[PDB]
From a paper:
Here structural analysis of hydroxyketoacid aldolase from Sphingomonas wittichii RW1 (SwHKA) revealed a dynamic movement of the metal cofactor between two coordination spheres without protein scaffold rearrangements. Holo‐SwHKA forms a trimer of homodimers, in which each monomer adopts an (α/β)8 triosephosphate isomerase (TIM) barrel fold. In total, holo‐SwHKA contains six equivalent active sites; each of which is formed from amino acids from two different domain‐swapped dimers. The transition from M2+ R to M2+ A,S is induced by bidentate substrate binding and occurs without a concomitant rearrangement of the protein scaffold.
In a previous study, several variants of SwHKA were created at position F210 in order to probe the influence of aromatic electron density for CH‐π interactions with hydroxypyruvate. In the absence of substrates, M2+ R constitutes the predominant state and the M2+ A,W complex was observed with lower occupancy in crystal structures of holo‐SwHKA.
Residue numbers in the entry:
A (entry chain AAA), C (entry chain AAA), D (entry chain AAA): 1 to 250
B (entry chain BBB), E (entry chain BBB), F (entry chain BBB): 0 to 251
The structure:
């Protein structure tokens, strides 16, 4: 089963990691912690398909659901990741209902979508009964990260073939004319974020958000977000090294 | 146009270095840009092979730390290839005897001081036409002390002119002495052995380094007068940071 | 010369291999068998450009024509493969005449198409007279794998700049509401396949098909298909291992 | 600072290298010569993202500005390169004002463009004040390499968010019905090239051109081109080897 | 939390293993999910280097077979790096003497039983906090017997405590004895030599493995009481399958 | 179905070879298609590791030159893996003694002439069923002479039957003799030493090769009767060509 969908079905949110650093060793190590999922960022990172493919395997072995935040909402790219064992997709710049339908089209076989059939890794995980359960094995979230997406939230949330939305708050702040600060307190940004969550839940959809700290993630879980990521590997590692150096150098 | 670690030493100061077990260039550059004098890439207790180390050396140099490698083995050809790829410090495992220390030294210097083969693809680009005349000074070489035998042979190891000194691996020394392989071990016999190595190194006019798993332990080693202190592995730092973020996120 | 086009010019079909496993060693080994071509699948596989590039070289050295089935009908992706020495292209989801024209546009230099000039590997194979012969050095096939493509077959076959069509029968079955079974006996799927072949031949075009077995491939060659692939490396290897294990374990 | 923009601000053109061969060693070595920039060609080469990423680092270390000529004018591909430390972009097949606006959209954060925020490598080079200076850190040039682009030059040059244009003269010759000869003397091609330069300068924009020889590059610098590339690594290396062999074999 | 091969042995049963010469993770996982107890990655007669083996180990483990490696050489540092990357079985070539068998054993065990260096990046993730206390049991080590000399020295090789036993390479043994290097050779002198090795192994209370090129030969070796049987190389299986598909496709 | 270098020699002619320090297949194929008999991939003074050499061998073969490798070290297992990946010529560094020359020879020949392990993944594809009967002739092996010791031992090195001859590294020989490591050195003592090696090689009925940094120096070495001449490294040729293009572009 998809571990995130299991969380949801059991009435709990999912907490996920966020990787911008390529490689399998930290991917497995973080998957073995109390993360339900680990997202590999293929957008704001140097991680290409060749490097993502073994990382999916490593996260699955470590016992978290492997997710990818893609560089673009492109059906063929998403299909190839699904067939490589990405079991969650977070697609950037879903700004309109039509773009959300384009995301949905990639996530489902005919007749619900147009996903091409050749499920190399999912058929190894799920066996020959995969086709009947395929749609449920994948979680799909549309990114909300622009003014336009915010304006079109209800129309995006009307698309049956997506699970919900994923807020990209640094990009949303920037597009609203504010600083792209992680875990921002900017009142209009905080209000927009709450509005997206409320609309998603009203529409019977799931809502996620990207976080830069455990404390902000605790607040988002308390507010009812269904999928909360915290925090990027590179940021956590940089901050840890700075502290080690300060401690060493007195 | 100088080895940053050697510049620290020429000012009578220690060098503090990072320690990478995760392949890739992005964290390598980001950590090199911090207040580390060097960043060591571990090619022993990691999945980092030559193909992955090569671009990491470039990234560390661009970030402004001296690129170092802890090799999988004290093998002259492996070390030479790393030098020609722009490793400017070498930490070689399991140097247990004077002869093994001479083997390390042989790789680090052109004839007549050593037997290093000539083809310095990346050092020639960094140092330019002045390279060959200063080549030995551009590289730091440290012999690992991680066994009972190495401890018994410390003075003979330190007598080898062509190495700068020694690098203590405390976890492996504890395990070889019959203790648990603890990170930042303070096992009494291990502690005594380490103090002996540092005393002998400085008596010989050589440098002594040590691996640390924490900023706190590194601070103590710096206070004890170690010349080269590493802290802490990228993977360990990242794992611990993620565990803490998760605990904070899931807190009541 | 392109070995597939030589087959056609000499009045014989081409039989091709089908690789979903990255790497050069099996690619060369299979190219040295009595295959006229070897197709590298960049869609239902983990094979990215970095891994396809040496495989093209290895197939050419082994003495088969290197082909690629791309992840998408994208002109720039196809051009880069041509310049890396892919000498056949099979493009997915060609559903309309306009999509088939998009495929043709990538396969020909101006004035016939819009292919960008910088033929790194073809200029090494063919020399400075490459430009005059370039179009003939490449075989281009549009995939027919949807209901819509079937409905638009005559309009797709009207596009001068493609050699013909390549049936993807598992996807076609699925899109027709049937199980995506390899080498299917499903009557409507079998009928649709024969209809595509007959239309292609009537239009003076070539037709290919993907097969999962030697026996099915024998039948397709007998029915007159011009390009028959059999069978995917991973499927053949899995089946061989299962048999070895059954034999060993008694 | 971007070394090319420094040249321009100081009233001098930039001379750049041109790499079609993957790898970091020649990239650094050439960057250390008296090149202001080095362009990595991701179009007419086997260089994919995985191979370009370390090459950007190596060129920057060698002391030239790292540029990329992309396979396609795609915003998400361009963004990922920017975040990997490409500080110049040359985008193919900019044939219309709308296509030039698509290029501009990728090069600037909101409100000027729609660039997604997560500047992994530029934030290491430029620090936390990167956002305010981001646009100036990147040079963007639209390729002019078709009849249509030539016809639409004034409309392309009207787009505020691009620095100017980059002529691809082999493709331009081919699209005008001539041989795709490097450094051509063909009168209509030479005239078209001069016309693009004059229009660019009249519009207060920059103009670049691709060259195959030092002698042709000297003439283009004398004619006033702002960005001149000379010559591709593979071509220079092949010619050098041919000469070594002729000398050795007498 | 157990080595699948060792569990077979603790039940008095042989293990059957796959054999990979093709790099990549997809077939590695797919074959591991079959009724193989282990999958051996051949790093000797293949183009598989460390960078390619590392993700394959992960894929085999996920598929549910024990990941094994046949190394290019009996070199302790190479073997240690593979162990720390999650190779849980090692087959080392050209073990011709007791001293070479001791060299293999030295790599597989921490002090005091061996000299394995401490940094178990992947085994610590698989086994958790219980790892170090069981580390030796988590790994299987087999010395290859592939020469006349190894055959003469079989009893001394089998006397080395820290190896589980031996792995016969019949094609190389045939070639070294002066015969054609046939796959699944049945050359009479070779057959006799192999039976001698297996008898001596079991007399010593050790395990004996053998490489096979076919299911049929593997079935015989299992019947003869071999403890570890490999069958058959991915490349050979794939090539033969493709030849048969082509013959079927081109048949009248 | 023949080694192009050996065919040159069987016609009483020298072979001219390229020399690659840059990884990648595109220039490798392009240079192989020129009038080079062989292309040597340098795995010593380069960043080319096994994973990168493997596809380069394929590319050189397709381009129509014989693929050769100058290894990082004279190690039999490394050499065997390269042979099985389709390296058809081996140039091994630091062959200083007859015993080291025997070590090189051991890797290049199956039993009984050598100890090469059997698994010829790529040579079996190139040569087909006729491979094993001709295997030794398909490979050329040259021992590098680059030290004072090697020069003193030249006759004993040349007495080893299983090597085709020697390959002189003039820059490293100059450095080991106490001179500057100049490319195409003409240092008088170095020049004398090189002439001695070539005379001894031909006296022994063996082949003698030499590394060159220029077409002009290669022409002289061909005139002096060397059997295998390399010229010139890809990186050096490319750098010099780019410097000249820049000087032409920036000229008044
Ligand atoms: Br945790
Ligand atoms: Br809408
Ligand atoms: Br810091
Ligand atoms: Br066949
Ligand atoms: Br239509
Ligand atoms: Br210059
Ligand atoms: Br327009
Ligand atoms: Br099975
Ligand atoms: Br030539
Ligand atoms: K978990
Ligand atoms: K620093
Ligand atoms: K063939
Ligand atoms: K420069
Ligand atoms: K299994
Ligand atoms: K040639
Ligand atoms: Mg399809
Ligand atoms: Mg040398
Ligand atoms: Mg173009
Ligand atoms: Mg964004
Ligand atoms: Mg150790
Ligand atoms: Mg063997």
């Amino acid at each position: 089963h998809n571990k995130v969908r299991t969380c949801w079905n059991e009435g709990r949110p999912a907490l996920a990691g966020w990787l911008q650093l390529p490689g399998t060793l930290h991917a497995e190590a973080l998957a073995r912690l109390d993360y339900d999922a680990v997202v590999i960022d293929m957008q704001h990172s140097p991680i290409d398909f060749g490097q993502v493919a073994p990382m999916l395997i490593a996260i699955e072995l470590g016992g978290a659901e492997p997710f990818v935040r893609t560089q673009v909402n492109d059906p063929s790219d998403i299909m190839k990741l699904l067939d490589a064992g990405a079991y969650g997709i977070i697609a950037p710049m879903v700004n309109t209902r039509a773009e959300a339908q384009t995301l949905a089209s990639a996530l489902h076989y005919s007749p619900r979508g147009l996903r091409s059939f050749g499920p190399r890794r999912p058929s190894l995980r799920y066996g020959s009964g995969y086709l009947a359960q395929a749609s449920e094995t994948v979680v799909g979230l549309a990114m909300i990260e622009t003014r336009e997406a915010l304006a079109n939230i209800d129309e995006i949330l009307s698309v049956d073939g997506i699970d919900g939305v994923f807020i990209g708050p640094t990009d949303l702040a920037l597009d609203l004319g504010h600083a792209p600060l992680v875990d921002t307190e900017e009142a209009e940004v905080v209000s927009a974020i709450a509005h997206v969550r409320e609309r998603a839940h009203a529409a019977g959809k799931r809502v996620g958000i990207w976080c830069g700290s455990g404390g902000f993630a605790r607040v988002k879980l308390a507010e009812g977000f269904d999928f909360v990521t915290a925090a990027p590997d590179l940021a956590m590692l940089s901050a840890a090294a700075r502290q080690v150096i300060a401690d060493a150098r007195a």
